[PDB]
């Protein structure tokens, strides 16, 4: 999957999304704080947000929400339902355009 950025830092994710993206662009990359896991770096209102993806070994989810068997499945749900990712305080973060 081309939105999957394997060896990229949150810093280079922000580099790419601010120079190569538009609002609504996103990518998944691996976690820094939790080695072996992933993170979604999404672009909203000219800045980048990072969302941790929970891999429980039984499913994937966004530490709450629908659960998925694969990462690409998760990304497709959120792409196909742009109202479904809300950040605690109500605000919606749309995953609209894969960065790549």
């Amino acid at each position: 999957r081309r939105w999957f950025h394997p060896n990229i830092t949150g810093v280079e994710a922000e580099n790419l999304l601010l120079t190569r993206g538009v609002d609504g662009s996103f990518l998944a990359r691996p976690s820094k704080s939790n080695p072996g896991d992933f993170t979604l770096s999404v672009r909203r209102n000219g800045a980048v947000t990072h969302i941790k993806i929970q891999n429980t070994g039984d499913y994937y989810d966004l530490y709450g929400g629908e659960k998925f068997a694969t990462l690409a499945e998760l990304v497709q749900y959120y792409m196909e339902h742009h109202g479904q990712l809300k950040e605690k305080n109500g605000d919606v973060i749309e995953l609209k355009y894969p960065l790549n």
């Binding site: 810093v11 980048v48 947000t49 969302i51 941790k52 530490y63 709450g64 950040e87 605690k88």
Partner: peptide, 7 residues
Amino acid sequence: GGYMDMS
């Protein structure tokens, strides 16, 4: 980084 609070 600009990390969302997962909660």
